[PDB]
Amino acid sequence: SKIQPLMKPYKLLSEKEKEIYRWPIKESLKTMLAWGWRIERTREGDSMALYNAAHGYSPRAIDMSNVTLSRDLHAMAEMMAE
């Protein structure tokens, strides 16, 4: 019947799916922290929510691929891909 009951907030999500989602992120964080680099936490960069069902689920699509990035972050991404 193609019924997926997994549509739920992350607080009540399963531990297995949460670990599956978190494992690549944790691995990436460990890889970038092993080398050792400065971390920027500027307050002017708080752009988490700037772009324009059950339990108030209202998804949206964000197209942020047009933002140009620095060469240092490009090299870091290349190293992560390698």
Partner: peptide
């Protein structure tokens, strides 16, 4: 993933 929240890795 890295652009959000202003997280920039620098040497």
């Amino acid at each position: 993933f890295l652009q959000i929240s202003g997280y920039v890795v620098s040497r």
